[PDB]
Structure formats: C-alpha cells, structure tokens
Short mmCIF file of C-alpha atoms and ligand atoms in Angstrom, two decimals:
data_model
loop_
_atom_site.label_atom_id
_atom_site.label_comp_id
_atom_site.label_asym_id
_atom_site.label_seq_id
_atom_site.Cartn_x
_atom_site.Cartn_y
_atom_site.Cartn_z
CA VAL A 25 0.18 0.08 0.07
CA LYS A 26 0.99 3.55 -0.58
CA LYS A 27 -0.46 5.52 2.45
CA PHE A 28 0.03 9.29 2.98
CA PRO A 29 0.75 11.38 6.01
CA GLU A 30 -1.62 11.83 8.92
CA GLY A 31 -4.04 14.94 8.16
CA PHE A 32 -2.96 14.90 4.40
CA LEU A 33 -5.50 16.98 2.46
CA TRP A 34 -7.32 15.44 -0.40
CA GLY A 35 -9.08 18.00 -2.31
CA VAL A 36 -11.10 18.76 -5.60
CA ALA A 37 -10.57 22.34 -7.31
CA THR A 38 -12.81 24.59 -9.33
CA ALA A 39 -12.69 28.49 -10.47
CA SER A 40 -15.62 30.82 -10.50
CA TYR A 41 -16.07 31.61 -14.16
CA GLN A 42 -15.73 28.06 -15.21
CA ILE A 43 -18.62 26.56 -13.12
CA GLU A 44 -20.74 29.36 -11.87
CA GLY A 45 -22.75 30.96 -14.71
CA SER A 46 -24.97 34.03 -13.99
CA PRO A 47 -22.05 36.35 -14.62
CA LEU A 48 -24.02 39.44 -14.25
CA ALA A 49 -26.40 38.35 -11.56
CA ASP A 50 -26.99 40.33 -8.28
CA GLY A 51 -24.97 43.51 -9.19
CA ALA A 52 -21.85 41.55 -10.56
CA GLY A 53 -19.68 43.80 -12.78
CA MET A 54 -18.55 42.29 -16.19
CA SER A 55 -15.15 40.50 -16.30
CA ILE A 56 -12.70 40.30 -19.04
CA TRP A 57 -13.85 36.62 -19.52
CA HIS A 58 -17.43 37.83 -19.91
CA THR A 59 -16.37 40.37 -22.69
CA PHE A 60 -13.58 38.01 -24.40
CA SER A 61 -16.08 35.10 -24.76
CA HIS A 62 -18.74 37.20 -25.97
CA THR A 63 -16.48 38.18 -28.72
CA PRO A 64 -17.06 36.15 -31.78
CA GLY A 65 -14.00 33.98 -32.75
CA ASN A 66 -12.27 33.82 -29.33
CA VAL A 67 -13.79 30.60 -27.66
CA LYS A 68 -14.68 27.26 -29.42
CA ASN A 69 -18.39 26.87 -30.70
CA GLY A 70 -19.17 30.52 -29.46
CA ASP A 71 -19.17 28.91 -25.86
CA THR A 72 -19.34 31.37 -22.83
CA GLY A 73 -19.59 31.44 -19.17
CA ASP A 74 -23.10 32.60 -19.19
CA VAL A 75 -24.65 29.35 -17.80
CA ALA A 76 -21.64 27.06 -17.35
CA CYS A 77 -22.56 24.38 -14.58
CA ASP A 78 -25.10 26.92 -13.18
CA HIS A 79 -23.20 26.51 -9.77
CA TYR A 80 -24.24 29.86 -8.96
CA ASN A 81 -27.63 28.29 -8.11
CA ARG A 82 -26.54 24.63 -7.52
CA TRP A 83 -23.75 25.33 -5.26
CA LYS A 84 -25.38 23.35 -2.30
CA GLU A 85 -25.89 20.25 -4.28
CA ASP A 86 -22.27 20.46 -5.49
CA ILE A 87 -20.84 20.74 -2.01
CA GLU A 88 -23.24 17.94 -0.66
CA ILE A 89 -21.29 15.94 -3.55
CA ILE A 90 -17.99 16.83 -2.11
CA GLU A 91 -19.24 15.78 1.46
CA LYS A 92 -20.59 12.58 0.00
CA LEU A 93 -17.43 11.75 -1.77
CA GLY A 94 -15.82 12.27 1.67
CA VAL A 95 -13.24 14.87 0.06
CA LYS A 96 -11.51 16.81 2.77
CA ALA A 97 -10.71 20.19 0.90
CA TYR A 98 -12.23 22.34 -1.79
CA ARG A 99 -10.31 24.69 -3.76
CA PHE A 100 -12.51 27.31 -5.26
CA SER A 101 -11.98 30.98 -6.67
CA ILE A 102 -13.75 34.10 -5.91
CA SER A 103 -14.86 36.29 -8.76
CA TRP A 104 -13.45 39.91 -8.24
CA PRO A 105 -16.23 41.49 -10.08
CA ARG A 106 -18.88 40.12 -8.01
CA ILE A 107 -17.18 41.38 -4.90
CA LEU A 108 -16.01 44.81 -6.40
CA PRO A 109 -18.23 45.48 -9.70
CA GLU A 110 -15.80 48.44 -10.85
CA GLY A 111 -12.74 46.60 -9.34
CA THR A 112 -12.16 49.10 -6.69
CA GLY A 113 -14.21 51.22 -4.50
CA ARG A 114 -18.08 49.86 -4.06
CA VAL A 115 -18.33 46.56 -2.41
CA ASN A 116 -21.32 44.39 -3.38
CA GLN A 117 -22.91 42.57 -0.19
CA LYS A 118 -24.72 40.03 -2.56
CA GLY A 119 -21.44 38.86 -3.94
CA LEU A 120 -20.10 38.51 -0.47
CA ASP A 121 -23.12 36.67 0.68
CA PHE A 122 -22.88 34.05 -2.12
CA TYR A 123 -19.37 33.19 -0.88
CA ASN A 124 -20.36 33.37 2.63
CA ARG A 125 -22.92 30.68 2.20
CA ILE A 126 -20.44 28.32 0.42
CA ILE A 127 -17.72 28.87 3.19
CA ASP A 128 -20.22 28.25 6.03
CA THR A 129 -21.43 25.14 4.47
CA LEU A 130 -17.95 23.80 3.82
CA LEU A 131 -17.18 24.40 7.43
CA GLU A 132 -20.41 22.81 8.55
CA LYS A 133 -19.55 19.77 6.70
CA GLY A 134 -16.02 19.68 7.79
CA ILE A 135 -14.58 20.58 4.44
CA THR A 136 -11.27 22.78 4.33
CA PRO A 137 -11.78 25.81 2.17
CA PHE A 138 -8.80 26.72 -0.03
CA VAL A 139 -9.64 30.09 -1.69
CA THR A 140 -8.06 31.29 -5.04
CA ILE A 141 -8.24 35.06 -4.97
CA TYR A 142 -7.76 35.46 -8.56
CA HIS A 143 -8.37 32.76 -11.18
CA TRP A 144 -8.54 34.94 -14.44
CA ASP A 145 -11.81 36.71 -14.25
CA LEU A 146 -10.46 40.36 -13.69
CA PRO A 147 -13.02 43.19 -13.59
CA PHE A 148 -13.70 44.73 -17.06
CA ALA A 149 -13.62 48.09 -15.38
CA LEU A 150 -9.86 47.66 -14.46
CA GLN A 151 -9.15 46.15 -17.98
CA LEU A 152 -10.24 49.61 -19.40
CA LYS A 153 -7.34 51.00 -17.41
CA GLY A 154 -4.82 48.71 -18.77
CA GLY A 155 -5.51 45.57 -16.19
CA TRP A 156 -2.16 43.76 -15.42
CA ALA A 157 -0.29 46.08 -17.74
CA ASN A 158 -0.83 48.89 -15.19
CA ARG A 159 1.51 49.18 -12.23
CA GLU A 160 -1.59 50.60 -10.09
CA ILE A 161 -3.05 46.86 -10.26
CA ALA A 162 -0.71 46.27 -7.20
CA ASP A 163 -3.02 48.72 -5.49
CA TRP A 164 -6.14 47.49 -6.82
CA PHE A 165 -5.37 43.73 -6.15
CA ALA A 166 -4.32 44.80 -2.41
CA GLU A 167 -7.69 46.55 -1.75
CA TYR A 168 -9.64 43.50 -3.16
CA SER A 169 -7.53 41.18 -1.16
CA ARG A 170 -7.92 43.15 1.93
CA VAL A 171 -11.91 42.94 1.53
CA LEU A 172 -11.74 39.24 1.15
CA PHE A 173 -9.40 39.04 4.27
CA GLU A 174 -11.82 41.38 6.37
CA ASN A 175 -14.76 39.62 5.17
CA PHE A 176 -13.78 35.86 5.42
CA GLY A 177 -10.37 35.48 7.11
CA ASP A 178 -12.24 34.62 10.22
CA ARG A 179 -13.24 31.23 8.72
CA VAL A 180 -11.06 30.70 5.59
CA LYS A 181 -7.26 30.06 6.68
CA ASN A 182 -5.79 28.99 3.58
CA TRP A 183 -5.24 31.53 0.76
CA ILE A 184 -3.88 31.47 -2.94
CA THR A 185 -3.08 35.05 -4.40
CA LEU A 186 -2.76 34.17 -8.07
CA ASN A 187 -3.61 30.99 -10.32
CA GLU A 188 -0.85 30.51 -12.70
CA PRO A 189 0.45 34.15 -13.47
CA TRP A 190 2.59 32.74 -16.24
CA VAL A 191 -0.78 31.76 -18.05
CA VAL A 192 -2.35 35.20 -17.31
CA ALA A 193 0.58 37.20 -18.58
CA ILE A 194 1.74 34.99 -21.64
CA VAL A 195 -1.38 33.30 -22.70
CA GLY A 196 -3.47 36.36 -22.00
CA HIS A 197 -1.34 39.23 -23.14
CA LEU A 198 1.27 37.29 -25.76
CA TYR A 199 -0.52 34.59 -27.32
CA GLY A 200 -3.74 36.37 -27.23
CA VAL A 201 -5.68 33.27 -26.72
CA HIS A 202 -6.98 34.11 -23.17
CA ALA A 203 -8.67 37.11 -21.91
CA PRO A 204 -7.72 40.12 -22.46
CA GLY A 205 -6.65 38.83 -25.72
CA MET A 206 -3.33 40.83 -26.42
CA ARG A 207 -0.42 39.88 -28.43
CA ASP A 208 2.41 42.26 -27.11
CA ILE A 209 5.60 40.93 -25.52
CA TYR A 210 6.39 44.15 -23.61
CA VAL A 211 2.72 44.33 -22.18
CA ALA A 212 3.27 40.48 -21.36
CA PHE A 213 6.56 41.01 -19.37
CA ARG A 214 5.17 44.17 -17.63
CA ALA A 215 2.03 41.90 -16.70
CA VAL A 216 4.52 39.30 -15.22
CA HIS A 217 6.01 41.84 -13.15
CA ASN A 218 3.00 43.47 -11.89
CA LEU A 219 1.44 40.15 -10.97
CA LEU A 220 4.41 39.58 -8.53
CA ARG A 221 3.86 43.09 -7.05
CA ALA A 222 0.27 42.48 -6.74
CA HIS A 223 0.81 39.02 -5.16
CA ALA A 224 3.37 40.54 -2.77
CA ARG A 225 1.23 43.42 -1.85
CA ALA A 226 -1.75 41.10 -1.07
CA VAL A 227 0.54 38.93 1.14
CA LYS A 228 1.59 42.19 2.99
CA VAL A 229 -1.99 42.92 3.79
CA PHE A 230 -2.75 39.45 4.75
CA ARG A 231 -0.21 39.71 7.61
CA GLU A 232 -1.89 42.97 8.65
CA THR A 233 -5.48 41.48 8.76
CA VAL A 234 -5.51 37.73 9.18
CA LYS A 235 -3.26 36.91 12.14
CA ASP A 236 -3.94 33.08 11.84
CA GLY A 237 -4.15 32.13 8.10
CA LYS A 238 -1.64 30.81 5.60
CA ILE A 239 -1.14 32.23 2.03
CA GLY A 240 0.56 31.19 -1.22
CA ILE A 241 0.50 31.23 -4.87
CA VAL A 242 0.01 28.67 -7.77
CA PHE A 243 2.15 28.03 -10.79
CA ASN A 244 1.63 25.93 -13.76
CA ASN A 245 4.39 23.37 -14.59
CA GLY A 246 5.53 21.14 -17.52
CA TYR A 247 7.93 18.30 -17.26
CA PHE A 248 10.48 19.21 -20.11
CA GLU A 249 12.87 16.48 -21.42
CA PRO A 250 15.47 17.42 -24.10
CA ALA A 251 15.13 15.70 -27.62
CA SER A 252 18.60 14.56 -27.47
CA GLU A 253 21.98 15.05 -25.36
CA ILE A 258 19.14 20.62 -22.88
CA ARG A 259 19.70 24.28 -22.49
CA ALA A 260 16.32 24.51 -24.21
CA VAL A 261 15.05 22.56 -21.20
CA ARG A 262 16.62 24.84 -18.89
CA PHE A 263 15.09 27.80 -20.52
CA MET A 264 11.55 26.13 -20.45
CA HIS A 265 11.70 25.18 -16.68
CA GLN A 266 12.74 28.64 -15.82
CA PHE A 267 10.25 30.55 -18.14
CA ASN A 268 7.34 28.17 -18.15
CA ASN A 269 7.62 26.60 -14.54
CA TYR A 270 7.66 28.29 -10.96
CA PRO A 271 11.29 29.85 -11.10
CA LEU A 272 9.78 32.72 -13.11
CA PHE A 273 8.24 33.75 -10.02
CA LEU A 274 10.14 31.88 -7.26
CA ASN A 275 13.35 33.21 -8.14
CA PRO A 276 12.09 36.76 -7.63
CA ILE A 277 10.29 35.69 -4.47
CA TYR A 278 13.12 33.74 -2.84
CA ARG A 279 16.13 35.03 -4.55
CA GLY A 280 15.09 38.68 -5.54
CA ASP A 281 15.66 38.48 -9.40
CA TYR A 282 14.23 36.63 -12.49
CA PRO A 283 16.04 33.26 -13.62
CA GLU A 284 19.03 33.77 -15.57
CA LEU A 285 17.84 32.42 -18.84
CA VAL A 286 14.68 34.41 -18.69
CA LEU A 287 16.78 37.63 -18.31
CA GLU A 288 18.74 36.37 -21.64
CA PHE A 289 15.47 36.17 -23.54
CA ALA A 290 13.51 38.89 -21.92
CA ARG A 291 15.30 41.66 -20.10
CA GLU A 292 14.57 44.39 -23.17
CA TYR A 293 10.79 43.63 -22.25
CA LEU A 294 10.69 44.03 -18.44
CA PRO A 295 10.48 47.69 -16.98
CA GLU A 296 14.12 49.45 -16.99
CA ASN A 297 14.10 49.61 -13.37
CA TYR A 298 12.26 46.46 -12.44
CA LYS A 299 15.09 45.62 -9.64
CA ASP A 300 13.58 48.46 -7.49
CA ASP A 301 10.46 46.42 -7.01
CA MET A 302 12.24 43.09 -5.99
CA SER A 303 12.72 43.50 -2.07
CA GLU A 304 8.97 44.12 -1.81
CA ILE A 305 8.44 41.08 -4.08
CA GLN A 306 10.26 39.18 -1.46
CA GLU A 307 7.45 39.23 0.96
CA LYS A 308 7.53 35.66 2.82
CA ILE A 309 5.02 32.96 1.58
CA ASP A 310 3.55 30.05 3.54
CA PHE A 311 3.25 27.60 0.55
CA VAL A 312 3.79 26.96 -2.99
CA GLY A 313 0.94 25.42 -5.06
CA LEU A 314 1.92 23.42 -8.15
CA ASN A 315 -0.40 22.57 -10.88
CA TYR A 316 0.91 19.69 -13.16
CA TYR A 317 -0.81 18.04 -16.26
CA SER A 318 1.87 17.11 -18.80
CA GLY A 319 5.41 16.32 -20.19
CA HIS A 320 6.97 17.79 -23.31
CA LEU A 321 9.91 16.95 -25.57
CA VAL A 322 11.81 20.10 -26.24
CA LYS A 323 14.63 20.92 -28.72
CA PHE A 324 16.66 23.90 -29.59
CA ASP A 325 15.08 25.58 -32.60
CA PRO A 326 16.86 28.59 -34.53
CA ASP A 327 13.58 29.62 -36.00
CA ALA A 330 12.01 32.11 -28.24
CA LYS A 331 14.38 29.34 -29.95
CA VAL A 332 12.66 26.33 -28.68
CA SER A 333 10.16 24.04 -30.34
CA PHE A 334 8.11 20.92 -28.90
CA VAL A 335 8.63 17.46 -30.41
CA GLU A 336 5.72 15.16 -30.71
CA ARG A 337 6.07 11.71 -29.10
CA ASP A 338 4.20 8.54 -29.48
CA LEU A 339 2.95 8.61 -25.83
CA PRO A 340 -0.72 8.13 -24.58
CA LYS A 341 -2.24 11.71 -24.92
CA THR A 342 -5.46 12.99 -23.22
CA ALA A 343 -8.43 14.85 -25.25
CA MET A 344 -6.19 18.16 -24.85
CA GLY A 345 -3.50 16.14 -26.90
CA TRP A 346 -1.36 16.42 -23.66
CA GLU A 347 1.17 13.76 -23.27
CA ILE A 348 0.65 11.70 -19.92
CA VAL A 349 4.02 11.53 -18.13
CA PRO A 350 3.21 10.58 -14.52
CA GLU A 351 7.16 11.04 -13.41
CA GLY A 352 6.93 14.70 -14.12
CA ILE A 353 4.74 15.31 -10.99
CA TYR A 354 7.48 13.58 -8.80
CA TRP A 355 10.14 15.60 -10.85
CA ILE A 356 8.51 19.02 -10.23
CA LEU A 357 8.01 18.28 -6.52
CA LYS A 358 11.55 17.15 -6.18
CA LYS A 359 12.92 20.15 -8.15
CA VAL A 360 10.96 22.79 -6.18
CA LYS A 361 12.37 21.53 -2.72
CA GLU A 362 15.98 21.42 -4.37
CA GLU A 363 15.79 24.78 -5.65
CA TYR A 364 13.75 27.00 -3.33
CA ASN A 365 12.78 24.56 -0.35
CA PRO A 366 9.52 26.15 0.33
CA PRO A 367 8.08 25.13 3.83
CA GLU A 368 4.94 23.61 2.42
CA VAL A 369 3.88 22.30 -1.03
CA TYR A 370 0.57 21.42 -2.62
CA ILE A 371 -0.53 20.03 -5.73
CA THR A 372 -3.28 22.56 -6.43
CA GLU A 373 -4.40 20.90 -9.79
CA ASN A 374 -3.75 17.60 -11.49
CA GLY A 375 -6.31 15.81 -13.82
CA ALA A 376 -7.09 14.84 -17.25
CA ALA A 377 -9.68 15.61 -19.94
CA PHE A 378 -11.15 12.54 -21.83
CA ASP A 379 -13.96 12.10 -24.16
CA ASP A 380 -16.43 10.93 -21.46
CA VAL A 381 -19.76 9.17 -22.22
CA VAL A 382 -22.78 8.05 -20.23
CA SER A 383 -23.26 4.39 -20.81
CA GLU A 384 -26.35 2.69 -21.13
CA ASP A 385 -25.85 1.59 -17.46
CA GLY A 386 -26.08 5.11 -16.35
CA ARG A 387 -22.64 5.25 -15.42
CA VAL A 388 -19.20 7.17 -16.92
CA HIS A 389 -16.64 4.48 -16.98
CA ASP A 390 -13.78 6.57 -17.34
CA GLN A 391 -10.90 4.16 -16.58
CA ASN A 392 -8.36 6.31 -18.71
CA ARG A 393 -8.94 9.09 -15.86
CA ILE A 394 -8.67 6.64 -13.02
CA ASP A 395 -5.34 5.34 -14.55
CA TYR A 396 -4.05 9.04 -14.96
CA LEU A 397 -5.00 10.22 -11.43
CA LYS A 398 -3.50 6.69 -9.86
CA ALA A 399 -0.31 7.24 -11.61
CA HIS A 400 0.25 10.88 -10.49
CA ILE A 401 -0.97 10.21 -6.89
CA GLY A 402 1.56 7.43 -6.93
CA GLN A 403 4.37 9.53 -7.79
CA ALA A 404 3.37 12.34 -5.43
CA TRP A 405 3.70 9.57 -2.63
CA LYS A 406 7.14 8.88 -3.82
CA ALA A 407 8.23 12.55 -3.46
CA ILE A 408 6.86 12.63 -0.11
CA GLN A 409 8.75 9.29 0.83
CA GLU A 410 12.06 11.39 -0.26
CA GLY A 411 11.17 14.36 1.86
CA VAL A 412 9.12 16.69 -0.20
CA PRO A 413 6.80 18.55 2.43
CA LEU A 414 3.54 18.07 0.26
CA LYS A 415 0.64 18.77 2.57
CA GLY A 416 -2.36 18.23 0.06
CA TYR A 417 -3.46 17.06 -3.35
CA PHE A 418 -6.19 18.53 -5.46
CA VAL A 419 -8.08 16.98 -8.43
CA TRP A 420 -8.86 19.40 -11.27
CA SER A 421 -11.81 19.23 -11.45
CA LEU A 422 -14.88 18.46 -9.11
CA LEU A 423 -17.09 19.22 -12.40
CA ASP A 424 -16.97 19.11 -16.04
CA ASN A 425 -16.72 23.04 -16.76
CA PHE A 426 -16.04 25.89 -19.35
CA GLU A 427 -12.67 25.12 -20.46
CA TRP A 428 -11.63 28.58 -21.30
CA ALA A 429 -11.02 28.90 -25.23
CA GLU A 430 -11.93 25.24 -25.64
CA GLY A 431 -15.62 25.92 -24.19
CA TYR A 432 -17.42 22.94 -23.04
CA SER A 433 -15.76 20.60 -25.38
CA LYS A 434 -13.13 19.47 -22.73
CA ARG A 435 -14.27 17.51 -19.76
CA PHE A 436 -12.11 17.39 -16.74
CA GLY A 437 -14.63 16.36 -13.96
CA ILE A 438 -14.66 13.47 -11.70
CA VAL A 439 -18.44 14.25 -11.70
CA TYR A 440 -20.00 14.50 -15.28
CA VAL A 441 -22.37 17.47 -16.11
CA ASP A 442 -25.11 16.95 -18.48
CA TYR A 443 -25.51 20.58 -19.90
CA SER A 444 -28.87 20.05 -21.19
CA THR A 445 -30.49 19.36 -17.74
CA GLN A 446 -27.50 20.39 -15.49
CA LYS A 447 -27.54 16.81 -13.99
CA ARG A 448 -24.44 15.61 -12.10
CA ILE A 449 -23.40 11.97 -12.64
CA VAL A 450 -20.30 10.88 -10.30
CA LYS A 451 -17.72 9.16 -12.88
CA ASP A 452 -16.05 5.98 -11.91
CA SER A 453 -12.95 8.16 -11.26
CA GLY A 454 -14.81 10.30 -8.59
CA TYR A 455 -15.93 6.96 -6.84
CA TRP A 456 -12.45 5.71 -7.09
CA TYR A 457 -10.92 8.89 -5.78
CA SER A 458 -13.39 8.84 -2.80
CA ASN A 459 -12.09 5.44 -1.83
CA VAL A 460 -8.58 6.85 -2.09
CA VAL A 461 -9.52 9.57 0.28
CA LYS A 462 -11.22 7.20 2.76
CA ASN A 463 -8.20 5.15 2.73
CA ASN A 464 -5.73 8.09 2.85
CA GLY A 465 -3.78 6.61 -0.23
CA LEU A 466 -3.40 3.93 -2.88
CA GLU A 467 -3.57 0.07 -2.47
O1 LIG B 1 -6.79 22.83 -18.70
C1 LIG B 1 -7.42 22.51 -17.29
C2 LIG B 1 -7.18 23.35 -16.40
C3 LIG B 1 -7.84 24.63 -16.28
O2 LIG B 1 -9.47 24.45 -16.45
C4 LIG B 1 -7.55 25.64 -14.86
O3 LIG B 1 -8.59 26.75 -15.08
C5 LIG B 1 -6.46 26.15 -14.98
O4 LIG B 1 -5.96 26.28 -13.62
C6 LIG B 1 -5.33 25.18 -15.68
N1 LIG B 1 -4.04 25.16 -15.85
C7 LIG B 1 -3.62 24.03 -16.39
C8 LIG B 1 -2.33 23.67 -17.00
N2 LIG B 1 -1.73 24.83 -17.77
C9 LIG B 1 -2.36 25.37 -19.02
C10 LIG B 1 -2.11 25.04 -20.19
C11 LIG B 1 -2.66 25.54 -21.33
C12 LIG B 1 -3.65 26.51 -21.02
C13 LIG B 1 -3.78 27.24 -19.77
C14 LIG B 1 -3.11 26.64 -18.73
C15 LIG B 1 -4.74 23.25 -16.89
N3 LIG B 1 -5.66 23.87 -16.15
#
C-alpha cells in the first residue's frame, strides 16, 4: 500500500468563471472573460460562461457531492467583479453573501476551504485602465484582497493570491488566446512583473489582517525533457515553470535564462521592486498535467517535439514521473516550507453508458499514476501537504469551451444533471483510505 501522512488534505478544485454561470447576477460587474467570450472567434463554438455548470444556483448540491465523496478540501475561486463590480471602491454585499454561504456550508460539513483570490476573471472596469499592464493593479489587487481577508479571514485560513500568473501574462497578453486577448511581448512581461508586485502587496496586507491564516501562490508546470543530449529544457523550466516567480520571491531576481530572453521587455528599473516582491509566503501550489519533449530550434528558440505517448483529449502527453520531478525540483531549488499539488487531472472524451455510469478508466489510470508519484516525493522528503484534483465538475474550459471534460463528476449541460464518474468513486476510496492500494 501507499498510505499518505496523517492529516494529508485530499481536495478537488474549481474556478468561478468555469462553473458558476450567472456572470451578471446580483449586481456583479463584467469580467474580461465575459467580454472575451462574447467576442466572436475567441472561444470554441461560441461557448461562454453565461450558464456553465449553473453552480451559482446549484452550489449546495455540488458541496453535498463533495461531502458525500468524503473529500476533505475544496479549492474554489472568488469572482473579483462580484465583490467589487468596478474593481475598486464599491463592495457588493450580494457577492459576499454568495461566497459566505459556500464557506459556512463547507465548514459545517467539515471541508477545508482553499480560496484562490484570482483565477483569471479580472473586472472589465480595470481592464479598461490597462489591467495587469498597469502598475496601479498592485494597489487595486491589495484593496480587493483586503476586502476578502476582512470578510472571510475569520473562517477561511488557506489563501492563494494568483492562479498561474505565467498563463495570465503570456497566454492572455502575448498569445492572445485567453482574456484580455492581447499580443504584445512588452505588455506580457509588464504583466509578469505587476502580477508579482500585486501578489506581494496582497501577502503584506494578509499579515496585517489575518493573524492566523496561511497564504501562497499557484504555478503551472510542465515536465520538460531534451530531444537529445538541454539548455532549451533549462530555459523552458525557468520561463514556463515556477522559477519565473520563485526566483524573484526567494532570490530577488528573475531566472538567468529568462533575463537572457526577456530583459528588454521588463521595465527598465524592475529591480527596484524586488525587495517588496520577496514578501514571505507560507506555501507553494504546483499545478501539473503534462510532459514535453523540447529541442533548440533557431527559427524564443525552442520547439516541442511530438512523441508516441498516450495523450489526453487535450493532446497532452501523459507523463506521471513529471509530478515527482517538479516536486523534487521545487524542494531542491527553493525549499518552500509547504507544497500542495493544487491541480492535477485529465480531459477525456467521457460518455454516459447505457448503465447510467461514466466508465472513465483512462482518468482513473491517470490519477492513480500521478498520486503514486506524489507519494514517492513525500517518501523522499518533499513537504507535500495536499493534493487537488482538477476538477470536481466538467466545466467551461476557457478557449475550448464545453468541449473538454476534466471532471470526476459528469455534467449534462442540457439538464444540469451531475453523474459521479467511476474516477470520482475511485478517488473517494483513495481519500477514505488516505492513499493507494
Ligand atoms: O486545462 C485544465 C485546467 C484549467 O481548467 C484551469 O482553470 C487552469 O488552472 C489550468 N491550468 C492548466 C495547466 N496549464 C495550462 C495549459 C494550457 C492553457 C492554460 C493552462 C490546466 N488547467
């Protein structure tokens, strides 16, 4: 058997815009994902978050699912524009009430809330003022965070400032594939820098307001392997994985190969902000899904190489040893005091069988493999305190819309019916037993 430490936090994870629907209910402001997805051509099939999983109405049912599965922690995010419709200034009590009910319910049922302050749904009103490109977002984000800490910090004790700031900056502002949909490398690296300053201001305010909580930050990571016998792999790790942010946080500067590629794109006096950026954090969250074969390519000087490996419906190569590697590597490089896997999961082409069940053996296999490797990392000293499946529910998968299903619970969008998939029942057994067998 592979049993985990006493008190290990088994969780499931979601995000506000992906599950809630009702983006403009109860005085909420528009977010950039509202305006981006209502822009023709941005999202597959013209899909939007208007209805999504209707979690905005079905939240109690969904939490009852969490309880019934015996899952111990729920990672969810707060929609900034529900709380502050213009991004700063006015506070919307109805937005606060929505998350208060979720929080109180989880607590009553013995489930631990992990709150992501920002999972990509910036208020539109702030995007009009430049969003992440504007240095003033360090102030806006701090004010927003302060509101959350004051309203919920009595009950919520585990906080995440940002989900995947690399995606926010580069996919949102260089690739143009995510909101706000821009393609400017100088904007993208100012967003990188402002994301750090906003993260650090929010941590600073947390210490002033929530004397008992813990706060961290979440990064996306790939497992990069070199196509032959390498510096391309070094670059991809430092740019795409946690070092882009952790080197500022822990060491007070950007990683070396990031500066080689990107110094001209960062503000001229960016080092002036570094001492503030070093604000102490309590934990690192690592999201992990996939591995990549990578080669130097003269025509950022890196390309991916396709491998005959099992892939998910995203076309993402299934490489379980990556989650062990990234956990080892984070301890080796920065030694944070606590680590969580804040997302791990897979998209498969799920179908409800004639028996009324979703036989997602492919997802069970994927989860089991990765859980096994995280177990390994714990045996060799990585302080992993928890593991979160992405996702509780099939949901709006950003620019893929509803076409990608990541849930351990199937959602029939025509009726909003939830069907627990075999993987969800499987996971529940894992949580009950506190590990694999
Ligand atoms: O793609 C699945 C999930 C997504 O629904 C979450 O909102 C997000 O936190 C998330 N991040 C990754 C891994 N990195 C990534 C790759 C391509 C596009 C965006 C993020 C996967 N996921």
